[PDB]
Symmetry: D2
Amino acid sequence: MLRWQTAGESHGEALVAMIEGLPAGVRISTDDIVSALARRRLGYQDKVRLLTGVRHGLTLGSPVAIEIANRETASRVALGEVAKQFLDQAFGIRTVAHVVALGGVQTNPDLPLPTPDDLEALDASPVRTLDKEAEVRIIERINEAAADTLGGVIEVLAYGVPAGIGTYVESDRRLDAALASAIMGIQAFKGVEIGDGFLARAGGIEGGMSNGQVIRVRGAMKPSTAVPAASVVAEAMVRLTLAKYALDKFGGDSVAETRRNLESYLAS
Amino acid sequence: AMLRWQTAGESHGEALVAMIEGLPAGVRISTDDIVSALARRRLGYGRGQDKVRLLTGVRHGLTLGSPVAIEIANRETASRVALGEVAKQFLDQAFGIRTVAHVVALGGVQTNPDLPLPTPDDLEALDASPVRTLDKEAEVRIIERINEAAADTLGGVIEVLAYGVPAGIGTYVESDRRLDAALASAIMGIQAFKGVEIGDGFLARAGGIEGGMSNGQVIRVRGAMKPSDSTAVPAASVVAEAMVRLTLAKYALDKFGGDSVAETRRNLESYLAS
Amino acid sequence: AMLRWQTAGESHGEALVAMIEGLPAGVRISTDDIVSALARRRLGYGRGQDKVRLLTGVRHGLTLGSPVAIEIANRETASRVALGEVAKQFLDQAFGIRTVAHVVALGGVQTNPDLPLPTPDDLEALDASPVRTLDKEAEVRIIERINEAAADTLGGVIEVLAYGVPAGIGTYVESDRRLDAALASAIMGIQAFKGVEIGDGFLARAGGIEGGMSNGQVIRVRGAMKPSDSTAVPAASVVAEAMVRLTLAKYALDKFGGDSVAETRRNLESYLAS
Amino acid sequence: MLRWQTAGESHGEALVAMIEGLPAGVRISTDDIVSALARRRLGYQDKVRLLTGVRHGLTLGSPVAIEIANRETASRVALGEVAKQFLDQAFGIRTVAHVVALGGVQTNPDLPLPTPDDLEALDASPVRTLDKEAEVRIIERINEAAADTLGGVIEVLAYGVPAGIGTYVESDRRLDAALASAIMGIQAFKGVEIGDGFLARAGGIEGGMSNGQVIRVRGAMKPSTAVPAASVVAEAMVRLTLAKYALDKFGGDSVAETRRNLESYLAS
Ligand SMILES: [Cl-]
Ligand SMILES: [Cl-]
Ligand SMILES: [Cl-]
Ligand SMILES: [Cl-]
Ligand SMILES: [Cl-]
Ligand SMILES: [Cl-]
Ligand SMILES: [Cl-]
Ligand SMILES: [Cl-]
């Protein structure tokens, strides 16, 4: 079972993150993590060590512990980076995060959904959106406001998820249940939807199981603005939950065995 | 032992079975209580009896502290509603916690938010309403809206409110163990639910949970669902109530413990004296 | 979902109830199988009927994949023995794993270790023996020993053997998740048990588990217990067998999975082809 | 719930141990841990950092992570040291570990049981026993043997445990069940007993619950000798299980609240 723990005080010598149950063969580097941490600072000099579980840039199958030199989101974002690598390398699964509403201003829903290829443009946007018209209105609104007190709605999309991850049983063990819980557990979040949700299309989860479509998770939040950073942190938690459920369903001891189990299932 | 439960049964086998472990000795519970809560899951506006046995864990009308197994005669929601009736009796007797469920929107037709929140004393009236709301005005539009539609295909929004929850249940740690996270999970795990809010979230007020923990105010949980010939939404609210109760029972039991309703009651009384 | 089980019932209430979740569809199981396994828990040398319902999870004699609830008519060991009968049928049908239980010592009187180990084909003979051993010589001394004693106060050592377990079940990681650790826990959690060995441990042979994992040999688990007018030891062996089976079912299900006995069987067949 | 994880490769830059759910107020230092690690080397230059969860020599209530600079038992022994501090400071509970048989030679059971005050004498004994007659026979036997292949039986005693920790319910959640599992999960162990066990007085656990007596746990093992080190490692795991169960039964958020909950229960 993929399991993780974080540690470290706002003003201490280090933050520690530890993840267990990841298979051997995942390519992960400290520069990957430094890069993932920089992204958390974005919105209108991190040092990382991989202490255990890695040799020659690959996971070994043992527990991976990360030391980050410095409330904090760093350690969760670091874990999300490891989860990101694993999901892509083992399954072709990739996520995207963006802000779809901030301070009451909505983005245009008729516009194309962002994709993983839009990552550079989203990092470049001060409020993490491709909707250039909404962005300038959001910026105006931020400037009329203190900044970190404004609310918003964020969205995380997951591509390449194969159908069949989750359970048909009605319980918190369903995939939409686990995701809803992962988001709402983030400070400031007050709501979560799968797809159109309250507006109701399914958002890629139907009857507790992924259906093969894009998974669209939205989180409402209400506590220099904090909304873009929240989208990034939420992406980390969505990645971790997705990694956990995908590994439970197709898990092998090495990334190569894991793909091999995906191709088997997918060929029947 | 954490409060833990399980259900079983096929929609056309002889019986449905529900089991719950971790409940303290001394909860006052009867088959009658359950037959009653089961009746309510059938209410709902349309346009076109239950037998219960307490197989284990109860003696002389009171829980023993051991696992309680319930046989309900015969997807099903009965075993969960039954379970919520047991949680209801525990919450009220040990903590004076009571919940209420109502439909705040159905098929696009919203109710009026200004109207005062329903309270537990409004139960009989809520059961009497075909669409489970106190908004007479809205009830007629919703009925109109159902009539112009197949009924059970319409979705809506439900609300569950919890009165009397003391402050300090849940945790500051940002994780799954937060009370708001567990409730989101409890709702979202019910078939057809696509959304969940604490307070007026997507529009916002904390809804009684701040920083992962109950603050003493009324707790408000909303859920959006979208699936004779009746609508499914009022019943969804009754099921959501069942799961909110179970979660609240679990978390309250964890904080105030006790091997008996009396001891649990004393631990709360003690905690509130600081 | 991990194989998971729960029992309930009071020693003088209407029924005992046992429930097990996570079992694959297609296990062949009948009330009859259970009445039978329940009869065996009563065997034991002395000096001075069961009704079973499969309330859920079974249709046309086969498991459905959903939770299985069992009502046994009426401390008790019946619900665990019932549960072990279900695990027995699963183990044998999905993996060809079968177990045997026997008493290797009682009241200080040891059996002879040189004699060949009992096999599953020795069941009928083991049931026929008042002290559940194939050591005719020892059986008479034990009976002698019981006679010179209150019978149920005498302790002893029991052994459970598991044939056909494939290699690779459990883990290398030094923790609770090792197969030998889980079995130690399964036994030690039974009332009166004070000791547990894998193989000939205290005297030593691996007993089929090395480095936290099954190696393909026969698995051997020993347990030391010390509490008409019969001895309790032969029945303890039957209960220990029930818990060893459940643990083995859990761990095997975790490694070979499958939503059906057929699919699980194919995953093992696949694993053994490397 | 007291929860711990360990990480680190036999030949890597560090070993990491992390423990969560410990209350604020436990006095613990890196010198305590260095000392506990030295004890593991004993039998016929460790550097430790407390990365998180501690300030002014006291736990804060958050997760405690430990870095140890170097199969390994170091990280478990480190966790046992933290567990030791907590158990003594919160409950007056203290443990002892010793070898009661090695290579077939038995110690004298008529002799006084060791106590926590016997710690210096036990560390000083090359085979961890107060039975001086048995010790020289054990040493002879070791010398007649390769050394690390000899088996033995170890014992861990726990003093000051209050009656009532565990459960009467027949399951692996009983205290004797949890302890049996903690020992047997250690490599090389093949058997565990509570009290006289197979010999059968109760060894301090009756009907799944501690009874107020001394808890006596024995572990049979069969893989320069390794038996004394195994006794120390087993003590670490017994400490952790005891800490976990005691905290579940009387746990408060600070050591002071925890004692206070013990005195309450104990006064009724
Ligand atoms: Cl990407
Ligand atoms: Cl907004
Ligand atoms: Cl609606
Ligand atoms: Cl009471
Ligand atoms: Cl004996
Ligand atoms: Cl099948
Ligand atoms: Cl000490
Ligand atoms: Cl020995």
